[PDB]
Structure formats: structure tokens, C-alpha cells
Amino acid sequence: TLNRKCVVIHNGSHRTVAGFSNVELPQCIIPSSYIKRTEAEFIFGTYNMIDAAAEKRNGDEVYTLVDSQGLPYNWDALEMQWRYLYDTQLKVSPEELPLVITMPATNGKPDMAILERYYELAFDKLNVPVFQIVIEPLAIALSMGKSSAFVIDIGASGCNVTPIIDGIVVKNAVVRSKFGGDFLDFQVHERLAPLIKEEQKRSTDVWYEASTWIQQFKSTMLQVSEKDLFELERYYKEQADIYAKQQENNPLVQKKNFLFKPLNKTLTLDLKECYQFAEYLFKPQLISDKFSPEDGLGPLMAKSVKKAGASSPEQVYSLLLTNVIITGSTSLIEGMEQRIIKELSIRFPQYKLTTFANQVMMDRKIQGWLGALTMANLPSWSLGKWYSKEDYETLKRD
Amino acid sequence: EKRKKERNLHLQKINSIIDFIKERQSEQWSRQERCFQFGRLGASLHNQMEKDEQKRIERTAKQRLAALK
Amino acid sequence: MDPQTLITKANKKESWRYDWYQPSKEKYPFRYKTWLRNQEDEEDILDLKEFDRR
Amino acid sequence: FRQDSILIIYPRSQTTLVQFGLNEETFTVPELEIPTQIYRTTRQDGSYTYHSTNKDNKAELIKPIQNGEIIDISAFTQFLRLIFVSILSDRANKNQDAFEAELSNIPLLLITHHSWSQSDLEIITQYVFESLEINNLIQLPASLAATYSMISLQNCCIIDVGTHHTDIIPIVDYAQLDHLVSSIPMGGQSINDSLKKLLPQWDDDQIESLKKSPIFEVLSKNSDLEFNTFWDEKGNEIKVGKQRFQGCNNLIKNISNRVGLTLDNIDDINKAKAVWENIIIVGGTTSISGFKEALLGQLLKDHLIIEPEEEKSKREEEAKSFVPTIEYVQCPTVIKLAKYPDYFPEWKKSGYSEIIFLGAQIVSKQIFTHPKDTFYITREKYNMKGPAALWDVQF
């Protein structure tokens, strides 16, 4: 291998995962937001913010750093975030080591200028000697061992569906949804609010509730319906009557209990209401009428399949559907993958689905970081585009 | 000519990156398995030191009889 | 005995540096600090039993 | 390797535990405790000369470690050199053929800290294999040394209550979760400062003698008496009331809060529960009686997943007209302290405040007495990669 050591920084919409290339597990996983404390004070990291969110001081405002598009928009606080990375966590100068950063798959327009900003963040500000940009669905699909794959990253900003054929990203079929982890945070808050006595600027308390107990609801209480919810009810009664007649119960009425800590209170929900939150990721028309059934992940995948046909279509269809990869932290919820399999097989009944997924709980949260980690230690520099300072010296001229 | 060269370079880049990534996945599994195995061997060292020092304490307890006389 | 002689007599060989390096394809337009192999041409004793716990 | 030549150094912010050679019968408490400090003589032209004593009052006092962090890597390496050369001189004076038997091949095991930089560890690797000329090196983490002295538990949590800081380290699958390792800037001195707030008329020494008195415990017979008498460092008798049962509470609450916020972020709940059931609490500060049990009880008070007593009381009133238990989906139903090794005689005699060092007595019996060179750098591996060979031998 090469006598090198890379810095691997992943700026997700909710989590920023930073580490080195000589390790498999990151040095730090901090949030992708910051508490402005007010002179100004920008509070960085996991434990420093939550304690500051536990102080509940006025002026403390959580501002996010990566929007729903997966790209940064507040570049000075991102700069100070990376200074916090290289100083407090990584403990290394940014001039010494090469860098590997990530971008989400786009349609083709926003890249270059953000490239320039990456230039203006690595060269003019950090004096990074060289940095590599990898594409996050390409990094996830390639670190698992594929060059043609159908990537479904269910994160906090939404569902990101990306076709990749032989190592190149099919950009017109890259479709980013909006319903993801932060939407489930809002739904869990709005539904449990009459039971917990509750029911930007208060984004300190909103982020604190979404970071302490709503995530605990997501990891323990939520379960994704493997079929459609009404179709689950029909299928489960149809199974249970066969069992009852073969030998001589409603599965929804199973009570799941959540020990809510700020009131020390049992929150009892049946399994249908546990299914109900995850039903809005696939059926967004059940909260409101402004959302089509096309807006959910169900057709949209297939929609992102079909624009890949005009990249001959029916071979691209099988090449994607035999290489489906499901990733993302929000997809760690129980039953997410089987809903993708069933909901994608009902729109393509002809083709056999062979879906692969990294079954490790931790490693699916940091799967884009792991993709950039596999892209960092490549033993040939020609395997990826390494923007040195000469590239931004060339982009300055006219 | 110039087309054969490009197509073969793209195919070699694809196959080589897939090969090295499979190698690093095997490195991941190997390092994790070594961590589990050497931890469980350290537990066996704990058990062996327990048995030896328990035999020592039992002999000294039986032996105190000579001191008592 | 002398500290350097105590060290050299014990534990019986390359040296390494933390230097800028430019990789080759020829040479890439950047550098990076890494651990490079050096080439060919590249005090006191505290007394013990003072801190022995007794 | 010869077990007489196994050298273990455990440096901290205040002191450093040093042992050269294993007893081969049972594992013993470290006898050498050298405070981590060096003397910097600023020589004209700018160069530094490091000494064991203040050379003619020309040297300044450099303490290379504070709060577990290396703040001066060159002074730390030359202080390791001072220790190592002192051991070489002692064995050469005592045995006088030691360079053929005892000093001919010295494997070094330096117990490391989580806050030490990767560049710092690579400078330590370059220094051990070049300047000290030591042929082999294990850089052992302190939390892994703690869980290898404990019965080699797969999943645990390390609470290292130092003097001015407390380290909270989760360990899953014999590996350190570096993105959840945290430290509060609060340790044994906060017990002191709380007693300064509660007892104004004393000074630093009487309150420190109270903290190091046998009558200072935390409730969770001394507890029957209102007043009790201890003795000063200078032998003066001093009486104290209920303040010998207080002062530790704020440290216990902040450690419980940081351990809770640390271990709620373990996404694999099956790993998380086994971490919660294996709470390991270390430090000299933890030599206070009843401190560990009170911290366990505070973890039970703040984070144990149980039905609320009011809801259970209403439901038991509803049953009076057998009570089944509410089953929650929360991980942390059981919180336990990890079971201590009760089979080391000298370590039971001298206490388990320094049990981390004990793991180094076990691991250097593991690796240094077995032919596999998987987790120490050889001269082969050093001549191949340098300090970059350190990241092929990690746990």
C-alpha cells in the first residue's frame, strides 16, 4: 500500500463522522448542527451541545449545517467545525495529511461551485495539501463491493435513491425524497405530545428532544410494516384464522411500553400506532392531501428505476434490481428492508430481488464514512480524483 | 488504438477497486475475529490463574495445621 | 554507567522521519506529511529505592 | 521472552507505576511510583537538557502529563528514558551480567491514554525503537488494560475517576468506542472543594486528611455516630460531624449523567445491556469506601428502566378487586458493577484502585510469553514501516 494517512470527514445532514484512514472506527461522531451561545460562542460536539441544551440558556440556538440536499450551506461554521475536528478530536494539522470528503449524488448542477467552496475551504482556509471528493451513494455501493447498484439511503433529510451502472452515477435518475429521520422526529413529537404534557429559535429544545428520547423511541418503539398497514392487517388476520382453524389473535393489540424520562411515565401504544409513523415514509398522503402516494418511497424507487432505463431499459432494470443496497440510520428501524423488498417487487413482479445490506447497527449509520474510508486507503492515486492546490489555481483563471 | 486502451483502463480500474475493497473487508473480519479470540484467551488465562492460586490457598489452609501443632 | 552506553548495551536497525513526501505516478502536484524511511546518511539517572513504596 | 525482562510503565498526570519483571508465582502491586516530572535546562543556543533533579537551579519543572493528556511529548519520552536508564543502571549494578540475561532483550509495554494523539503515539514508537533502542513495544490502552484485569469481559464501561478529571469509556467487543469516549473535567479534587464549601474553617491539608481518613464514607459503626475523630498529617486530632458523609455527591451525579448520556448512544441494544451490566470504576479517588456503591445506586436512581412507583401503586390498587410486570422496550433494565477478581492476594491486600496496571501484568503474560507477535511491533515491523507499523498491531 501507499505510505500515507488520510483524514476522512463525512458531513451528513444530521451526523458528522470524522476519523483517520488507519482506523476502521471513527475518532468522533458529532452532530451536524451547532449551538450559538450568546459575544458569539459556537458549541461543537455531542456532549458539549447536549449539556448546553440541558442548561437551557437563552440565546442558545441550534443551527444546522447541512440542509436536506446533503450539501453544506453555512461554510464558516462548517470551517470552525472542521477546526474543532482537526484540533479537539483528530489532533493533527490539516496541512500534514491528505483529506477525503463526501458529496451526495446530485443531478449535475450544484457540484462545481461547491467544489470551489471545497477548494475555498481546503486551500484558502485550512491549507489542505490535497483532498479527494467521493460520491456518497458511489462510496456506499463501492465499499460493499459493487460498481452497478441501486442505493437507497434512508437518512434524516429524507430517502436518497440512486442508480449506479458500472461505476458511474446515473444522475438524471438520482431522486432525493424528503421523508426521513427528522420527519419521524416531528411525527413522534406531535403524536406523543398529549401524553408528555407538551402539546429556528427553540431549536435548542427541539434538537435536545430529538437527540435524547425521540431517538430512543425510534430505536426501540418504532417498527416498519413489511407490507402495507391495511394489507398487513388483512394478511395477518388471514394467517391467524388459518392457525386457529388448523389447531381447532390480533397482532396489533400488543401493548408496547415506553418509559418517558422527563415525566417518569409509561407511554402505552399498540403495535398499529408503532407501525403508523413508518407508514408516513411510504404513504405521505395519510398526514395531508398535498402529498401524493408518488411522494413516498414506494413508487419513487421505481420512478428512479425507470429514468435509469433511458440512461435496453429492461436490462438496466434487472441490473439495478439484482443489486439493491439499503443503508442509512433511519433504515435501522425494524422491518424497513422487507417493506422495500415487497414494495419494490409489487412494482416489478417479473424480476427477482437480491437485496444486500450491512447488517451491523453502527456501520449502517456511518456507511458513507466507511465508503470514504475505503476510498481513502486506495493504493493507487489514479483510482480517484485528488484535487491538489493546482486545480483551484486553474479554476481562478477566467 | 485509443478506444481499446480507454475501455481496458476503465475495466481494470473497476476490477482493481473491487478487489482491494474485498481485501479490506477481509481485513475487517480478520481484525475483529482476532480481537474476540485473544479476549477469550485472556479469559482462559484468568481461569488458569484462578485454579493455580486456589490450589495454593487450599494447601496453605490445610497446612496451617502444622503451624497450629 | 553512561546512559547512552546503558541503552546501547541493552536490547541486542533503521531510523524513520516525519517528512513531506511527494508521490509519483510523474510526480503528483501535492505533498503530504508521512513517515519516510531514512537513508544511510539520514543524561541523568534517578536513584531507585527513594520511590520504592515502604 | 524472559519474564524478568518484561517492563511495564503506567504514567499519569501525577505519578507513574513502574515494574521490571514478573514474580512468576502471583501478581504483585507495583513498587516503583515515580512522579511524572522532568527538569528542563535551557542551554544557550536554545537546546534543552533534561534532568532528574533541578540542575543548579537552572532547570524548570516540566510535568509532561496533565489530565491524562501528553502536553510535552519530548519531555515525556525523555522521562521514559530516565526511568528506563535508571532500571538499566539498577540491574547492571545488582546483577552485573544483566546485559546478557536481564537487559539483553527487554520487551516494553507502555500503557497509553485515550486522549493521546496519534502523532504522539507515533513519536513514542519512533523514540522506543530508535533512541531507547528497545526491540519490542506494546502500546496498551488504559481502558483495555482495565477490562483485561477484570475477568476479560466482552462488553463493559470504564469510569476512571482521576484527580482533576473523570474518564468515561465504553468498551464493546473488546474494542474502544472512540466516538463515545468522554471526560468530565472533574475528579477527586471536587470532593475536596465540596468539603471546602461545607467546612470553611479548615484548610487544604485538614480536608485532604479527612478525604484520606478511614472515617470518610458515602451512605447509600460510622453511620450511627454523629461526631467522629480523625488525625491530621501532623498527628493532630480533629473531630467532624456529618460532613464526613458528604462532599462526593456532585461528582457522583455528574459521572452518572455522563455515563447515561454515553451509553444511551449505543445503537446495538444487546451490546448496550451487557455494557450496563459491567460497570467498572477505577481511580485512586475510588479508594473512598462506599463511593462505588453510591455511584451504582445513583445509576440505578437515574437510569434504571423500571415501572414508576406511582403507576405500580395505582395498578396494585386496581388488582385489589396478582400483579404482572410492565415490560418496557428500554435497554437498561439491569445495572450492575462488574465482578472483581478476588483471586489476586497482593491486589486484594493493596486494593483495586490501580487494577488497570494488573491487566498489564496479565497481557504481558499473554503476549510476551507466547510466540505470536500480532500486537507488538518487532524490529522487523519497525524496519518495514516505522511508526506507521503501530496501526497494524492495535487491538
mmCIF file of N, CA, C and O in Angstrom, chain D residues 160-205:
data_model
loop_
_atom_site.group_PDB
_atom_site.id
_atom_site.type_symbol
_atom_site.label_atom_id
_atom_site.label_comp_id
_atom_site.label_asym_id
_atom_site.label_seq_id
_atom_site.Cartn_x
_atom_site.Cartn_y
_atom_site.Cartn_z
ATOM 1 N N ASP D 160 -12.911 6.084 35.058
ATOM 2 C CA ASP D 160 -11.589 6.355 35.616
ATOM 3 C C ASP D 160 -11.668 7.711 36.303
ATOM 4 O O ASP D 160 -11.552 8.751 35.649
ATOM 5 N N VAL D 161 -11.875 7.702 37.614
ATOM 6 C CA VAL D 161 -12.002 8.935 38.381
ATOM 7 C C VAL D 161 -10.599 9.340 38.812
ATOM 8 O O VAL D 161 -10.052 8.798 39.776
ATOM 9 N N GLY D 162 -10.010 10.285 38.097
ATOM 10 C CA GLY D 162 -8.683 10.775 38.401
ATOM 11 C C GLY D 162 -8.693 11.809 39.504
ATOM 12 O O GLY D 162 -9.549 11.803 40.394
ATOM 13 N N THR D 163 -7.723 12.715 39.446
ATOM 14 C CA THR D 163 -7.634 13.766 40.446
ATOM 15 C C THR D 163 -8.391 15.016 40.014
ATOM 16 O O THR D 163 -9.148 15.589 40.805
ATOM 17 N N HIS D 164 -8.232 15.427 38.754
ATOM 18 C CA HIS D 164 -8.907 16.603 38.226
ATOM 19 C C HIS D 164 -9.842 16.293 37.063
ATOM 20 O O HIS D 164 -10.370 17.227 36.450
ATOM 21 N N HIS D 165 -10.061 15.021 36.744
ATOM 22 C CA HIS D 165 -10.857 14.644 35.583
ATOM 23 C C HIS D 165 -11.405 13.246 35.811
ATOM 24 O O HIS D 165 -10.852 12.477 36.601
ATOM 25 N N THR D 166 -12.496 12.927 35.120
ATOM 26 C CA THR D 166 -13.029 11.571 35.136
ATOM 27 C C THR D 166 -13.295 11.121 33.708
ATOM 28 O O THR D 166 -14.046 11.772 32.974
ATOM 29 N N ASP D 167 -12.675 10.008 33.332
ATOM 30 C CA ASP D 167 -12.801 9.430 32.003
ATOM 31 C C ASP D 167 -13.947 8.428 31.979
ATOM 32 O O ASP D 167 -14.052 7.565 32.854
ATOM 33 N N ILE D 168 -14.808 8.545 30.971
ATOM 34 C CA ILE D 168 -15.918 7.625 30.753
ATOM 35 C C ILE D 168 -15.703 6.973 29.395
ATOM 36 O O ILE D 168 -15.732 7.654 28.360
ATOM 37 N N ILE D 169 -15.458 5.664 29.404
ATOM 38 C CA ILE D 169 -15.071 4.927 28.201
ATOM 39 C C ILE D 169 -15.934 3.680 28.039
ATOM 40 O O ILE D 169 -15.826 2.751 28.848
ATOM 41 N N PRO D 170 -16.794 3.599 27.029
ATOM 42 C CA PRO D 170 -17.476 2.328 26.754
ATOM 43 C C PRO D 170 -16.589 1.393 25.946
ATOM 44 O O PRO D 170 -15.838 1.823 25.063
ATOM 45 N N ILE D 171 -16.671 0.100 26.254
ATOM 46 C CA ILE D 171 -15.936 -0.933 25.534
ATOM 47 C C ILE D 171 -16.938 -1.960 25.032
ATOM 48 O O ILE D 171 -17.612 -2.624 25.832
ATOM 49 N N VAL D 172 -17.037 -2.090 23.712
ATOM 50 C CA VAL D 172 -17.883 -3.083 23.064
ATOM 51 C C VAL D 172 -16.997 -3.973 22.203
ATOM 52 O O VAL D 172 -16.200 -3.470 21.403
ATOM 53 N N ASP D 173 -17.122 -5.291 22.407
ATOM 54 C CA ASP D 173 -16.438 -6.336 21.632
ATOM 55 C C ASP D 173 -14.920 -6.215 21.730
ATOM 56 O O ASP D 173 -14.195 -6.298 20.735
ATOM 57 N N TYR D 174 -14.451 -6.019 22.971
ATOM 58 C CA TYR D 174 -13.041 -5.839 23.338
ATOM 59 C C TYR D 174 -12.374 -4.694 22.577
ATOM 60 O O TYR D 174 -11.174 -4.750 22.289
ATOM 61 N N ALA D 175 -13.137 -3.653 22.244
ATOM 62 C CA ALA D 175 -12.658 -2.537 21.442
ATOM 63 C C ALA D 175 -13.208 -1.242 22.019
ATOM 64 O O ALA D 175 -14.288 -1.235 22.617
ATOM 65 N N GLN D 176 -12.463 -0.156 21.841
ATOM 66 C CA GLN D 176 -12.817 1.119 22.447
ATOM 67 C C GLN D 176 -13.617 1.975 21.469
ATOM 68 O O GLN D 176 -13.160 2.252 20.356
ATOM 69 N N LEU D 177 -14.816 2.392 21.889
ATOM 70 C CA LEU D 177 -15.680 3.243 21.069
ATOM 71 C C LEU D 177 -15.220 4.689 21.225
ATOM 72 O O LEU D 177 -15.667 5.427 22.104
ATOM 73 N N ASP D 178 -14.329 5.101 20.315
ATOM 74 C CA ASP D 178 -13.631 6.379 20.454
ATOM 75 C C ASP D 178 -14.558 7.572 20.241
ATOM 76 O O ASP D 178 -14.284 8.673 20.733
ATOM 77 N N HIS D 179 -15.658 7.380 19.514
ATOM 78 C CA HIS D 179 -16.609 8.465 19.321
ATOM 79 C C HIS D 179 -17.541 8.649 20.514
ATOM 80 O O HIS D 179 -18.298 9.626 20.540
ATOM 81 N N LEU D 180 -17.509 7.739 21.488
ATOM 82 C CA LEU D 180 -18.265 7.895 22.721
ATOM 83 C C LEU D 180 -17.386 8.057 23.954
ATOM 84 O O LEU D 180 -17.923 8.242 25.051
ATOM 85 N N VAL D 181 -16.061 7.964 23.802
ATOM 86 C CA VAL D 181 -15.163 8.251 24.914
ATOM 87 C C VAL D 181 -15.257 9.729 25.277
ATOM 88 O O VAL D 181 -15.094 10.616 24.429
ATOM 89 N N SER D 182 -15.525 9.996 26.551
ATOM 90 C CA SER D 182 -15.640 11.374 27.001
ATOM 91 C C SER D 182 -14.896 11.510 28.317
ATOM 92 O O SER D 182 -14.461 10.521 28.910
ATOM 93 N N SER D 183 -14.732 12.751 28.753
ATOM 94 C CA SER D 183 -14.127 13.040 30.039
ATOM 95 C C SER D 183 -14.746 14.302 30.611
ATOM 96 O O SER D 183 -14.860 15.322 29.925
ATOM 97 N N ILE D 184 -15.153 14.230 31.874
ATOM 98 C CA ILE D 184 -15.588 15.443 32.558
ATOM 99 C C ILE D 184 -14.354 16.035 33.233
ATOM 100 O O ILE D 184 -13.464 15.289 33.676
ATOM 101 N N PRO D 185 -14.230 17.365 33.286
ATOM 102 C CA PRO D 185 -13.076 17.972 33.965
ATOM 103 C C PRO D 185 -13.271 18.039 35.471
ATOM 104 O O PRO D 185 -13.242 19.125 36.059
ATOM 105 N N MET D 186 -13.444 16.884 36.103
ATOM 106 C CA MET D 186 -13.936 16.823 37.464
ATOM 107 C C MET D 186 -13.608 15.474 38.082
ATOM 108 O O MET D 186 -14.009 14.435 37.560
ATOM 109 N N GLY D 187 -12.883 15.482 39.183
ATOM 110 C CA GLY D 187 -12.386 14.253 39.767
ATOM 111 C C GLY D 187 -12.318 14.308 41.271
ATOM 112 O O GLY D 187 -13.274 14.707 41.937
ATOM 113 N N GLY D 188 -11.168 13.889 41.805
ATOM 114 C CA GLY D 188 -11.024 13.773 43.248
ATOM 115 C C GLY D 188 -10.969 15.110 43.953
ATOM 116 O O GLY D 188 -11.301 15.218 45.137
ATOM 117 N N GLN D 189 -10.546 16.153 43.235
ATOM 118 C CA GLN D 189 -10.455 17.477 43.838
ATOM 119 C C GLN D 189 -11.821 18.107 44.067
ATOM 120 O O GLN D 189 -11.940 19.054 44.848
ATOM 121 N N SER D 190 -12.864 17.607 43.404
ATOM 122 C CA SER D 190 -14.187 18.186 43.612
ATOM 123 C C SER D 190 -14.801 17.718 44.922
ATOM 124 O O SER D 190 -15.588 18.444 45.536
ATOM 125 N N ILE D 191 -14.431 16.517 45.372
ATOM 126 C CA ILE D 191 -14.776 16.062 46.718
ATOM 127 C C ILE D 191 -14.158 16.985 47.761
ATOM 128 O O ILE D 191 -14.829 17.430 48.706
ATOM 129 N N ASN D 192 -12.870 17.300 47.576
ATOM 130 C CA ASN D 192 -12.166 18.290 48.380
ATOM 131 C C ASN D 192 -12.892 19.629 48.380
ATOM 132 O O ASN D 192 -13.306 20.098 49.438
ATOM 133 N N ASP D 193 -13.142 20.187 47.187
ATOM 134 C CA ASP D 193 -13.736 21.519 47.059
ATOM 135 C C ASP D 193 -15.148 21.579 47.639
ATOM 136 O O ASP D 193 -15.549 22.603 48.206
ATOM 137 N N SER D 194 -15.901 20.479 47.546
ATOM 138 C CA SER D 194 -17.191 20.412 48.223
ATOM 139 C C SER D 194 -17.022 20.407 49.737
ATOM 140 O O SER D 194 -17.831 21.005 50.457
ATOM 141 N N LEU D 195 -15.967 19.763 50.245
ATOM 142 C CA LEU D 195 -15.721 19.827 51.686
ATOM 143 C C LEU D 195 -15.192 21.198 52.113
ATOM 144 O O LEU D 195 -15.374 21.604 53.266
ATOM 145 N N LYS D 196 -14.507 21.909 51.207
ATOM 146 C CA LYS D 196 -14.139 23.303 51.466
ATOM 147 C C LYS D 196 -15.378 24.185 51.551
ATOM 148 O O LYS D 196 -15.441 25.107 52.372
ATOM 149 N N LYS D 197 -16.368 23.923 50.692
ATOM 150 C CA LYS D 197 -17.625 24.665 50.756
ATOM 151 C C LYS D 197 -18.413 24.321 52.017
ATOM 152 O O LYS D 197 -19.061 25.194 52.604
ATOM 153 N N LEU D 198 -18.364 23.060 52.451
ATOM 154 C CA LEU D 198 -19.113 22.653 53.636
ATOM 155 C C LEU D 198 -18.384 22.954 54.938
ATOM 156 O O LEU D 198 -19.041 23.154 55.965
ATOM 157 N N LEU D 199 -17.052 22.989 54.927
ATOM 158 C CA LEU D 199 -16.250 23.258 56.121
ATOM 159 C C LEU D 199 -15.303 24.417 55.829
ATOM 160 O O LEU D 199 -14.180 24.219 55.351
ATOM 161 N N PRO D 200 -15.744 25.652 56.089
ATOM 162 C CA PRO D 200 -14.900 26.818 55.774
ATOM 163 C C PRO D 200 -13.691 26.969 56.681
ATOM 164 O O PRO D 200 -12.636 27.418 56.216
ATOM 165 N N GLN D 201 -13.806 26.603 57.957
ATOM 166 C CA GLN D 201 -12.761 26.884 58.935
ATOM 167 C C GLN D 201 -11.558 25.954 58.834
ATOM 168 O O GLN D 201 -10.601 26.136 59.595
ATOM 169 N N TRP D 202 -11.568 24.971 57.938
ATOM 170 C CA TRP D 202 -10.382 24.154 57.749
ATOM 171 C C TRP D 202 -9.579 24.684 56.561
ATOM 172 O O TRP D 202 -10.004 25.593 55.844
ATOM 173 N N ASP D 203 -8.404 24.105 56.362
ATOM 174 C CA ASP D 203 -7.549 24.416 55.224
ATOM 175 C C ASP D 203 -7.469 23.204 54.296
ATOM 176 O O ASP D 203 -8.243 22.251 54.418
ATOM 177 N N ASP D 204 -6.536 23.271 53.341
ATOM 178 C CA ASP D 204 -6.418 22.230 52.325
ATOM 179 C C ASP D 204 -5.953 20.911 52.932
ATOM 180 O O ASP D 204 -6.430 19.833 52.551
ATOM 181 N N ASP D 205 -5.030 20.980 53.898
ATOM 182 C CA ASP D 205 -4.410 19.773 54.435
ATOM 183 C C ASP D 205 -5.347 18.999 55.355
ATOM 184 O O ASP D 205 -5.359 17.766 55.311
#
